[PDB]
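Worked example (supplementary).
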Amino acid sequence: QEIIPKGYEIEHHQCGIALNQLIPSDKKVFITSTIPQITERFEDIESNEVSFNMLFYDNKTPVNIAVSAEEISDSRQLLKLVNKKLDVTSSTSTKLVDYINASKRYNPPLNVKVATRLGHVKGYFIYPYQEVMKDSNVKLFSNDKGFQKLIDSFRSKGTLQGYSKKVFAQIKDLPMVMVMLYASLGSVLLREFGLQPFIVEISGGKTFTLNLVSSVWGTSDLITTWSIESMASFLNSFPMFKDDTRNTHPKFVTSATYNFSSGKEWRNILISTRVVTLQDPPFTTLDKSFRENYGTLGLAFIKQYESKKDVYKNAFESYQRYFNQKNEIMQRLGRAFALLQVTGEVLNDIDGFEHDHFKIIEQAYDSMVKNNKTIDKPKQLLEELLQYLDANRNNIAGDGYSSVKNGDIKAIYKRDYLCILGETVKEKLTHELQTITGQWDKKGYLIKGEKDRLQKQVKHQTVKYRGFAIKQEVLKELGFDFSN
Amino acid sequence: IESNEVSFNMLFYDNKTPVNIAVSAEEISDSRQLLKLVNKKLDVTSSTSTKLVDYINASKRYNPPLNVKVATRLGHVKGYFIY
Amino acid sequence: EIMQRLGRAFALLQVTGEVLNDIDGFEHDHFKIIEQAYDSMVKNNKTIDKPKQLLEELLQYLDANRNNIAGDGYSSVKNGDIKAIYKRDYLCILGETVKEKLTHELQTITGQWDKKGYLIKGEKDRLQKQVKHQTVKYRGFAIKQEVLKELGFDFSNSYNPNS
Amino acid sequence: IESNEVSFNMLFYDNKTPVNIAVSAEEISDSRQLLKLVNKKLDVTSSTSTKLVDYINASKRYNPPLNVKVATRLGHVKGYFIY
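After joint prediction of all chains, the assembly is encoded as:
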């Protein structure tokens, strides 16, 4: 039992318990029938501010309520807890504040350091697994219940090796799902390598691959359907899975992704169904496997890294400097590939998860440089222009072409090249004309002019036009043949 | 049963006619808010609000009200299914 | 594909009918009532199959613009742009017209068209075939005559006037 | 040195652990605002806020704090160049 502060009395009548104040002459002045007992104080190690739990009995029923410091120490605010069964009024608020203060002095609450997010916060790394948390003497406060249900989903289950033979062995070398799993594992390492967030997406089983990569740390409830910012800040170092890209508005998503890419602050990978892409496509039984064998491989991975941190660090530094060598946009993503590959190198060293990390990762790298369009905007745009011209031959002049009788001339067909008139290239590129035509030149697409000018002077019949001469070779590579 | 917060029904007589009005905890336990029920036929003023709050508190102590658990929606709420 | 996303909902309505059958005076056939409307949905609802929907619309459009279609039995397109090349085996809709229709959904819908078997792919494992007519080479999506007819179209320009 | 306004650092012990917190002049010299530091481990209430404000004033009188001129930007401010 706890002590009663000097000056206070506690009566036990039929009406129920009663905290009276003792005023000498001793006269008794009722304070409350709801004796507050402040059991714990919580210190958010991010904010360094503090809160409390108030416990009191509403006539046989314990009532624990989370309360701020002000609510407990400010009469006008303390009065607001009447809605939660606290016996207090504008008349007794001050006496109850004073009693609370004294009880706090004479019965110190338990001090609990508290964290509201996962991952790296200040000096600690907060794990969402009871087993790990009970050893570290920090608690995981999450008022918002969405994240709480997210944490109950982190709970591990099943054995380990059973995940490496029932789940993992089914897909040691399926490259797309395997790189997605690298994302879900190496998300933890961004803060370790100084790398900012990025994305790994699959598009074109999809939901199935996402549900499967969820089993690296727990249930398929880690997944969500497309806020993003708060969830990212909470997972912090842990990967985010977002599902059903299809069901939602495109204005919303791309904005959400640009927002996520920015940095409370977080540093993790977004895995969906600064982007690494997996567009190739890679059941009933392996689903039972990863549903019975929840997330054990994840914490194993973390422990593996922990073992030889500063070794994997130098390995990543090597992969980083090298991937920055091998197209401009793919070199922008050099650190991300470095990271996913060090993730694979870490996974290789785990016992029952041996596999070829170099080949899966180069396999998907080349899958990207081949299949992903946006890496090469100058070429893409060029193709779009040619496609357009492919359908507008009544406005093309040149060898074998009927003279353009009405309107504008869009290109001059010569055998060695197609000279797309400057005006059409402007109509296509607008303000990006200078840079894209520059890239076309840097890429060797065009037959330059005399005076260090991108546009060649090309003759047909009785006119000399000025336009960008695109070599027959490029036309053919892109699948076009303006030949008669 | 969703919020675990509480409200009350106040009964009073406006010269032979009963008046039952639903009132929040704050309205009954804070003089400034109790004063707002004057619009609903309650005899109270800025002068008497405190004494009436204290009387309400004491009356509540010695004639406890009936406790009713309550739901504002149908279906599954927390552990019950409300029909 | 979309009907499998609604799998749990149909499962549920089916368990609802299975529950209702067991009530005292409420006997009825739930399996037939439920399969009847499943198939009624896949038949009558267009939006389940957006790729076919879009395709038909495009064909509808081309049916009204043959003065801009070239190919077998067609007068050369003299004014404006070329929208398709009619070969006996297929209608090769030029890439630009498919873009003008699908805009940002081009890749996904053409992918569906291929996965659905609508088109005669090109040599280099590319969705757009190179189509030769007279002496000119266009690049477009070749839609098999079978699909044209299934959707109710006949892009032949050769039919004796006397009929 | 730009504003000529002033702020303070308060040091107190939360049972063996020093706590230094930056505080405005108003926070320290106005009971209503001083009360807001309860969130930062300060033992104060609406009942004791006035006495603690007065104690702070007196302690400030008899143990003057160190005066530090301060700048929040680099470069030329008023007469100095802050590196």
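Two points are worth noting when inspecting this output. Chain C has seven helices and five strands. The beta strands of chain C are 69-71, 84-87, 90-94, 129-133, 136-144.
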